[PDB]
Amino acid sequence: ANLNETGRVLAVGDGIARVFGLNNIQAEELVEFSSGVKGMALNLEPGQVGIVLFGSDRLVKEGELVKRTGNIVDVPVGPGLLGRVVDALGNPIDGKGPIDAAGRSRAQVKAPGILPRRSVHEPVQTGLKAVDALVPIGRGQRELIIGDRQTGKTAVALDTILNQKRWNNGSDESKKLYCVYVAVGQKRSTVAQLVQTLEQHDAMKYSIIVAATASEAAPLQYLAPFTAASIGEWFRDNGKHALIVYDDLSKQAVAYRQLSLLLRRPPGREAYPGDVFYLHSRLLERAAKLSEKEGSGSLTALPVIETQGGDVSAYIPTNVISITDGQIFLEAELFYKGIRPAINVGLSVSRVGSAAQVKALKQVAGSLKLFLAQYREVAAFAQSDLDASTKQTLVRGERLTQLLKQNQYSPLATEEQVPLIYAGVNGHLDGIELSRIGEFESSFLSYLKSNHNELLTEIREKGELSKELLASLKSATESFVAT
């Protein structure tokens, strides 16, 4: 009788269920069905409530009794979550007991606006030469990773999650960045091994993983990044720093195309609903840097787009690039030639980190960006004549790209990168063989680690460079060129 906490299924199909009654229900509120399957109240019409199933349709029957939750779609949040692995409803799935919560954030929270915000300025050290030097990422910035399948998109992201161990270890409360790995549309097998390798590097203790694998329900795979968003949001709110990774948004978008087409909304470009932008925009807008008045918490979106035959111009990628604060376009043609991480320079850009990067490196990498980005169009006009003007500048761009080459699971510290860029743009290494470039990288750090120890220590204390440390290192460089 009292259809006010309850209703009955009138019809169910294609991941939706039209329930009768539920008169006190509110939009976006959660609902439980006779077999404990959670749905969500999409639209409310006179007569019936459209409800989206967070699961198999099989688990529902026309006729079933449906209960209200009074909760709008929401997750457990707070410190406890770290070192655990949950699904789209913060339900524990590693089997390591119950989720230890601080409270419960909605998966649908609004973005910090114009005023509580503050220009991003602390760097997020990725340990990746090509990244840190060229497209550096500040805390609160939202940097895209956009490549073809099999390009080292996760590699890049994973490696950052690894590198934070330098900081998440020590007493320092402000140098700490916690990691949130959303696993949208991935395999169960892939995630296992991805947790394994995060435990193999200990980084588990300081990271939370939310995963909605390729088997799970469309609205789970859709709701996953959002709920992860709130999980991370807790840190950004309680004056700490968090790094969320959306792997990937392209598979999230695709789940949305699912629901949207089963709810019979018109298809736009590539059969996508007109609101597929708003999906990602309203998500990313949450990764953010706060003002001194609001604790100065920060949350760093590393979404991953995956393109198709290298296509940047596609309708999803454009949308996400027109949302993010730049992108790290990883090109396959380079990666096939053994260049790793295969960052296309003239197609990657950090938009707000070139003022967030560690001083030391910016000093030692004067313009390095468009050097290499206009070095690419030149070497691609040779296969003509001997021109010792641009021929001379070639010996650089090759030793330089040879210099960005980073073997996987190799997080370098800032002080270690700076001397390499030094010798790069100062050309201390041109007389060293092309197949002895990366080999020397190991030889040189062996040379610096027990001699010019303070050079490393002071760049690790300040992060700046006086003209004092310039000549002090311009003796440690040509020294090893002779010895």
Binding site: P266, P267, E270, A271, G309, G310, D311, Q383
Partner: protein, 49 residues
Amino acid sequence: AEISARRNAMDNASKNAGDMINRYSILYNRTRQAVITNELVDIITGASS
């Protein structure tokens, strides 16, 4: 000396048109693909009404 040059030149032409073919092949498949989707939509919309 000319024959050598002709040989080498023609050789690079083949490499380039080789690489061009690759690009246009990729572009072809995109267009094909969309031609299918945009064509299909026209029908779907006509059909809902």
